[PDB]
Design a protein around this nucleic acid. Sequence first.
RNA 1: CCCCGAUAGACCUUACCAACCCUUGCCAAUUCAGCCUAUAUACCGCCAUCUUCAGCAAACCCUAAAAAGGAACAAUAGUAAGCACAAUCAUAGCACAUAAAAACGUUAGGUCAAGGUGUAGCUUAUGGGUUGGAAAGAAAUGGGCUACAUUUUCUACAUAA
RNA 2: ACAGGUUUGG
Lengths: 257, 138, 194, 101, 77, 538, 132, 328, 49
Amino acid sequence: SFFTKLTADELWKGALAESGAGARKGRGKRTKKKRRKDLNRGQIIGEGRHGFLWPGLNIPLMRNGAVQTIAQRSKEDQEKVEADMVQQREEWDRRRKMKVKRERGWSGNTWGGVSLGPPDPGPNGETYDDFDTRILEVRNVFNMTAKEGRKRSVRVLVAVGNGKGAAGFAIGKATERADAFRKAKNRAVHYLHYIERYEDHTIYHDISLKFKRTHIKMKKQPRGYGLHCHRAIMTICRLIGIKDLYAKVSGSVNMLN
Amino acid sequence: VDVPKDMTKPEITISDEPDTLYKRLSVLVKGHDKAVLDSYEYFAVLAAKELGISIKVHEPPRKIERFTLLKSVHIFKKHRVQYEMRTLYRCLELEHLTGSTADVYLEYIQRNLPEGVAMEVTKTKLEQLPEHIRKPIW
Amino acid sequence: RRKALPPRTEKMAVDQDWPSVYPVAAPFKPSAVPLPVRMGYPVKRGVPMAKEGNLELLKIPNFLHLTPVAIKRHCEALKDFCTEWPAALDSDEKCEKHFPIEIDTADYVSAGPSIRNPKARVVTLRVKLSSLNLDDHAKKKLIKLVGDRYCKSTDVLTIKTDRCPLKRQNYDYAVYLLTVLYHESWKTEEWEKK
Amino acid sequence: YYVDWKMLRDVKRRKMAYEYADERLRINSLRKNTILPKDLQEVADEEIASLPRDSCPVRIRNRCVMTSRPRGVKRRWRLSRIVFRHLADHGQLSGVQRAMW
Amino acid sequence: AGFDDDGSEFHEHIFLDKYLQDFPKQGPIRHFMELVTCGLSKNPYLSVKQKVEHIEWFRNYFNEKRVILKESGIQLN
Amino acid sequence: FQDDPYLIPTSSVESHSFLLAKKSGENAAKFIINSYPKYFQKDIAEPHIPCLMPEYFEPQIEDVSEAALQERIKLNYNFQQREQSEELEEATEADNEKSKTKAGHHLGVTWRTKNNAERIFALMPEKNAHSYCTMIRGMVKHQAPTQALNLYTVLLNNRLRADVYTFNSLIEATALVVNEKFEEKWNNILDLLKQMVTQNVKPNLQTFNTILKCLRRFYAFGKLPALQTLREMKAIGIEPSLATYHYVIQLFYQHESPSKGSSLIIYDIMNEVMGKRFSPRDPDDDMFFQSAMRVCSSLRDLELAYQVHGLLNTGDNWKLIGSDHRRNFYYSKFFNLLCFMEQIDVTLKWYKDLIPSVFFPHSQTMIDLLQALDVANRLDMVPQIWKDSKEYGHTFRNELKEEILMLMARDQHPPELQVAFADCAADIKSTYESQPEWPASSLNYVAVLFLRAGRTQEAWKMLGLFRKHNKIPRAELLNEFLDSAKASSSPAQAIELVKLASAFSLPVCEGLTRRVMAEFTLTQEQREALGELTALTS
Amino acid sequence: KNRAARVRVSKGDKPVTYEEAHAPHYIAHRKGWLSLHTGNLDGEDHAAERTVEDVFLRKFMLGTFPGCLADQLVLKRRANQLEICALVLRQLPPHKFYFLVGYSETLLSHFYKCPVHLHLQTVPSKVVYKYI
Amino acid sequence: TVDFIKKQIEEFNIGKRHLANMMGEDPETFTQEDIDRAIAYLFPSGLFEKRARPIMKHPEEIFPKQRAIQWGEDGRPFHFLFYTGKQSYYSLMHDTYGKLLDVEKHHNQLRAKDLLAEKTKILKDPIGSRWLIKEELEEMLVEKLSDQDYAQFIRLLERLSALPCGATEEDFVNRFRRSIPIQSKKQLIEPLQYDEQGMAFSRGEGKRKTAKAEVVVYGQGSGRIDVNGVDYLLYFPVTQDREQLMFPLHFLDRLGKHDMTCAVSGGGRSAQAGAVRLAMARALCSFVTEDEVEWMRQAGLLTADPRVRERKKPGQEGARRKFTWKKR
Amino acid sequence: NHNTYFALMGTLRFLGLYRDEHQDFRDEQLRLKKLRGKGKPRKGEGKRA
RNA sequence: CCCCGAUAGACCUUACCAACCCUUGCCAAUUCAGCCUAUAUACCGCCAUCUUCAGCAAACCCUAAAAAGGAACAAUAGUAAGCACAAUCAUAGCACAUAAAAACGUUAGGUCAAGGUGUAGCUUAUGGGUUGGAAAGAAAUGGGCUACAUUUUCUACAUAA
RNA sequence: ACAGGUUUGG
Ligand SMILES: [Mg+2]
Ligand SMILES: [Mg+2]
Ligand SMILES: [Mg+2]
Ligand SMILES: [Mg+2]
Ligand SMILES: [Mg+2]
Ligand SMILES: [Mg+2]
Ligand SMILES: [Mg+2]
Ligand SMILES: [Mg+2]
Ligand SMILES: [Mg+2]
Ligand SMILES: [Mg+2]
Ligand SMILES: [Mg+2]
Ligand SMILES: [Mg+2]
Ligand SMILES: [Mg+2]
Ligand SMILES: [Mg+2]
Ligand SMILES: [Mg+2]
Ligand SMILES: [Mg+2]
Ligand SMILES: [Mg+2]
Ligand SMILES: [Mg+2]
Ligand SMILES: [Mg+2]
Ligand SMILES: [Mg+2]
Ligand SMILES: [Mg+2]
Ligand SMILES: [Mg+2]
Ligand SMILES: [Mg+2]
């Protein structure tokens, strides 16, 4: 019965079913709860169930200048050590069952308006520590492939800006959402505009622009009319540095346009 | 510079019994690969030329044992996996040996045998005649 | 506290004797071998892996304890155990007229805890019939007494004994067979006259 | 424990055959001859029929030692055709390699 | 190495006729037991002690089952 | 030791601890083998090796009182209950059963010995040969020798002769007690030695080895009967073992300090015993070389140390030293003479085969190796010894770092040896300021290593790390570095030097404020000359 | 598709060893055997004993040195003495490494009635051969 | 990786000295044929792939050609074609075109002065010169190459070789030339041997379909064959096998002019007939001139028959015949 | 003898020398199953009680 | 898929059934052992098929926006590590051929019954032992052997009877 | 309206 055993790596690979044939096309996502626990985390190689104290593993080699013989813990001492060992289990499960915190940009279950952090530094060594970026839109884009069929790829729109008038936007598309986030952060700095801000709080004049199918009407406002604009235009102007603005979007409300 | 002195202390006695004689001593060393057998042949011939035994070396034909097993687990018999076990042989033929010379040769030979090879020692013991055949009449 | 000690390569002398570090079969520790050897299949843009952490150099049996200098130094101290072969038997023509009895003895070796090999009990006896004191009737009876154990082309009698457990027992039994086959060939019984 | 209850039964069958090996040999020596009169041979047959069932060497099954598979095992390694492959593909079996010719 | 077989020789293995003295010489017991002795002589796996309880098991079985050997029509001791 | 560098021992305490940990795992595995024998009863090797079979601690027969003791005597506390469980049924014990039982107490094991001694005599008339071999060897360790001289009178009265092992302990039981008198206690040993031959028992090596074991503690002038007994050892025909000469060399070391005339007797005794091959047939041969080479190490004799080493490497290079303590005390004082006496080439030749191979030295040999380089002006090997002393004397670094750098102040610094004075001075400064008392003398060395090297930049940054450590050196360092600042034409350095040096009341500040005036004129810094005068006044 | 002794290729970031980067059809071509004995020869016997002993050594060492074993063991069998070559990570101190080697050197000897040798080569990390 | 290779060369030199020390040869005469010979003995790895064996060479054959640094400490590139991606290949093309224009202008001036001192130095057929392959050019130019640019460079080299060649142009175009092995399939003719006062004695060896045949031929006897001690008529009762014996002899008209004794083993009747046919054909080359042995090899007597029975595949019947495949 | 190997390795795991990841995984899953609430019933009360 | 698990069934194998017995019941211990119980539509381990098809793909870059695409050799935005293909290796000389290999994915394809397994279920029973039986063909069908002969059959035998 | 969800493999 000893030769019938396998390694914990294959045991978890067979238990969690990460490489299952059902979670490939999309039949899964029902029970999206996958957690693998390492069993050798707090397992000292010296301790055992009998409580033997070996001079080479548990206890030091030389005590009082002499050699240590094979000793065994008492029952109450072994109950104390196993009590500490059991307490470490719930100590770790508490750190596991607790979800760390996120900041909601526009609503509790969206990615628009959330903070993504400063962009990654350049190759030459330039660091963008004053730059702050925000996600404007995340969309699961699908493509029809010959073999696999539906090929889901996340497309993300991310805008960077420092608050002094320099701001830009970019689109990053990748199979993974964090990869698209990084592809958009590191690509938004290459396309940076400079927005002339009258007195660093408003725009110089009321602009009424007509894009492809989007009508934007923005009006210059005094110091008391603070950012009464679309929920994404407010974020873009908060990245630019505009503290007072009124904007009205008519026609299509496509985020990229 | 720190060389020990008087390191050789052997215990060799010469018994009055007649030393045994050997006509032909064949050593057939078998292995899986050829490189270890080649280096071992080089080592054996260099160990025999020093003791002056005039060893002869040739290579017997190899033996390949192959078999066939099923490829899948439950049911797939049209697709099989064939395994192979190669066995190469090396023959070292020694002639005109004595009882202690063959012992001192097989001592330096067998103690230094590799792990993946084995050895078949065939000794041709030399004898004149037994006692009841010299000149008996029933 | 972690400690990383450099190997012996930086301390290995260029004229130091090699058999001192590899006296017997060793597992080829890369720290005690000053030769940089690259073993393994290379990468299209890479090179074969170095000796450090190389399982390929650890799978193969190393002959570092059997270099020419070490084998010469070993056999120079082994020259005291062997005896000198008498030159009076340089050719087999004198060996056949002096020692006509040949005893083929088999020996095997195998890696493992057990030593008993059932092929070790086999002892072969080869005697040339042209070297005995057989008369015409003794020879013509001994040929039909042994049968196929004696060949006519080479005229050699072969005894193949495997019944005894021990090799010395099979040897003594083969010599006993030789004695009885030489003796009973001279006894003429009553059924021979017909 | 063992691999399976049937392997636990097979080791017991092999122990019983190793215990009753010599008795069955001496009894078969009385049946596999024609020199003896046929009167005692039937009594020897009843004696060999009175022996325990799990004593005959015919009840032993050469199963795998690893997974106790009753079929598809090789006699040289005492391994099933699956475990033998699982150990030969990892390079853990000396001299064994894929046949290419 | 390490196996001496109780220091026995070939005349303890091949020659087993000295144990057939407690048996009928002219009956079928000799025709039958000479075969088991020819087998024990060519059995290298059994010891000179182990052959003895075999021939003694036959000596005991034949001397225990006396009624069938007398009702078989042939005389045996 | 394992040949891997991660497991190779660095220091001597590590060399001891690794072996002790390995033996601890060997004995831990053997404990499992003995505690669970059924998991190893299956034998696969044909030759049937007994060394790998489990050992049993249980006796076979428990009911039979005669058969229950022969098993328990060979395997302490449980053996004590065997005699009580045998005598509970009033079982008659023979003269051969209780002798081993008394030896089982005389091997392991103050009043329980009396309670056992009454049971061997009062119960049965035991043979005195099985009496003295237990009582004499047991009461010697209990610090009660009075009973041996009482038992000896009954032994001489019972018409049985005394065996050779009895006088091996009676002379100790007589000699160890001294109350203002020595001649009578020495005379009793002569009387027993004279009666030994009358008892028709030839005294073996151990009696003449123990008389010199007794002549060592009491009198330092007792060399006359010791030499006479050593001369009587050669007349009978038995060779004296190594400990016999050791007990002579120990007293000769005790008498060699006031008079060096006795050293020639220590010198001419080893020349005749080095001429043959010995073998360790005496368990007390471990102190022999410890006493025979300490005399040469004390009297500073290397020509004889070469022969006391050749006597070690003649017959058995390892079977003469049991413990590692004496080997470590051996090679340290062996290397203590090879440094300053013979030449540097042979010292460095004997350095690489003794220090990393056999054993690592103590804190004492580090000082001799340092005294070996400064007499012969050897500077190319200072870094090679320095890098080895890191892994060898890392514990004693805080007590040898004051003496390892001092040699550079006595020799000259050639223009080619600059990187060796740089790397070794950087590797000592990179470790102490990052964690360790820092001596002040090393700055006086690092200022002269960089003087002739032409590197004032790296030489100035170091002094700012010492002056901020709340400890100030002597003004000789400042006056020496002022010459480097003068040759490099850097006036802004001495203005930051003296303004922080005069504020702490140095004794040679009057010399520093004079030495700066001469550099200000050649640098043409007369404007900044009086500037610091105003600050020294204010 | 063949899946025996074959590590599937991930996105290009998994570290694999030289023994794992080669398919089983490369044994004796590009890589060798992890064990060497004589039972797998032509006219030799006692092969299954060595196979079960080898698998027991593997399953024993996997538990004896947990998480610190770099790659598979090398079991050399030469003249009644069995050598075990291991590659171990420097996660355990030598004080415990020596305890473990001294414990196994005698446990395996007393369990298999034959002399065993145990040699450890410690590496800083798992050696990467292919993409990492 | 400029310093790593430099350190590997020192370590390889130290390893070479140590190898010569442990092998016992003089380290001065220690060469690569002794290095690989000592490696093959000290580390006898039995593997089928030669590149998987242990090898110790100079680092310049192990490590590939590393690209040199392309810019200084200030960032300015060294070569003037660095911003072209292939600064070595485009520089080679630029030098080739610059020499083509120099040859053109020099030949125009020479034609204007009416002088012809150049010759046709492009026909290198008896030398056996060829152009560089793409791998051979990728070894010279450290950077990678493609197919179209290599064909453009070759097409420019032939344009440069089609013009009146100069002095320094021929040594530049020669360095892109490779000399091609021997293009001769002429077999080695065994000399006539004379053994035991026997004249015109030769021997041949043949093999076809697991049949080994050795044939000795005496050119002084009459026409007859002795195989395995028995004549060919009783050894080959079939007329086809004897016609295989008549095939090589009738081609040279030496029917009643040679005696032959053969020794064939293995295979069947037609395999033995073909093996002895090939052995007799290979043994008759010594008795005949060079023009007719070539007709023998062009008629199929001196070439082997590689047609060997294929191994049966698992899941099939006869290594080609598949099982009855049922569609449903 | 599979029982020898199994008992030896299990006793060594209880003594603290061998680390059996398979048995540890079994004990982890059994602990989480008993904490979920579906454990092993007592012998003598499964069918009746 | 159909001489397939099985390179293999009188008891055993055998997991099936009927009669009977045992329930901390292989192991050092465990309110524990053990289950060939369900789920291959949870899996690992092993395979089938496209498939001797060549594509898959991390990091980047471009597109008057980008779902996606990325090529013109007298070249118009493409560099690309890696896995495949190829090369090499094996059938002891080359070449050919065969063998081997064949990525990412499709068929929720086959396998809880090689082995372990996540989930849900048995514990005086869906668990563990002994004895005896597991037919039979109304019929259909797949794959093979033997033939239905004269280039056949029998005999001696290499093939001229 | 400062807008958001919702057509589709996308
Ligand atoms: Mg919410
Ligand atoms: Mg809308
Ligand atoms: Mg099971
Ligand atoms: Mg069967
Ligand atoms: Mg066919
Ligand atoms: Mg049944
Ligand atoms: Mg059945
Ligand atoms: Mg069931
Ligand atoms: Mg499926
Ligand atoms: Mg392609
Ligand atoms: Mg794209
Ligand atoms: Mg690519
Ligand atoms: Mg080839
Ligand atoms: Mg090809
Ligand atoms: Mg294929
Ligand atoms: Mg291919
Ligand atoms: Mg399905
Ligand atoms: Mg199904
Ligand atoms: Mg299951
Ligand atoms: Mg099922
Ligand atoms: Mg049918
Ligand atoms: Mg079929
Ligand atoms: Mg629609």
